[PDB]
Amino acid sequence: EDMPVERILEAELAVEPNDPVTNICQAADKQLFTLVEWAKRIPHFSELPLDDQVILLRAGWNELLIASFSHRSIAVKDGILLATGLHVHRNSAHSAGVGAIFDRVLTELVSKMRDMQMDKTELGCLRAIVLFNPDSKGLSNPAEVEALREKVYASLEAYCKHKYPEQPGRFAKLLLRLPALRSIGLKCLEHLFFFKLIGDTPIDTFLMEMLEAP
């Protein structure tokens, strides 16, 4: 009931035309501002009460950003393209002590997106599904968020099958990258909290705010 993939694609195109860890954290902070503008362009998000908009973004920002830089890097060999225009090569990540998580991103997300040629509309819908997370604690009306999520995947499935009729399992394949995104998202947060604890590794204000309690 009013969740056109065209609007979701527009939201995607609207927001995106020596320690690698520091560069990664700087890109993350930068992208958090852009993430807010993205969400506002997702149908019905802005109509939710402000408190729930805050809960949803605080609950999904890490997965939302990871999905974005992962898809952006499908053209990249063994590396990730940051929003800042900088590239982090697998070797660079490894030499910085963050090779394990880097490899998970390349193998579980980037390579899979590249192999199935996930398009921007599909990426946008998957992020919209993550955004509308009904399991987020504190939601004033979880049923409402769940309803929006359902409208997104209903539209996503219609898009698939019509766009890729010859791939009946495509819709399921897309949803099945969400568990990987959730796991990788959690590991990335663990790294961030450790960086904050250890000190060093500058962490800007918005990224820092996301690390605030809860």
Partner: peptide, 11 residues
């Protein structure tokens, strides 16, 4: 709490 996010969503 969450000063930045609120300001950005409201504006």
């Amino acid at each position: 709490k969450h000063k930045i996010l609120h300001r950005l969503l409201q504006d």
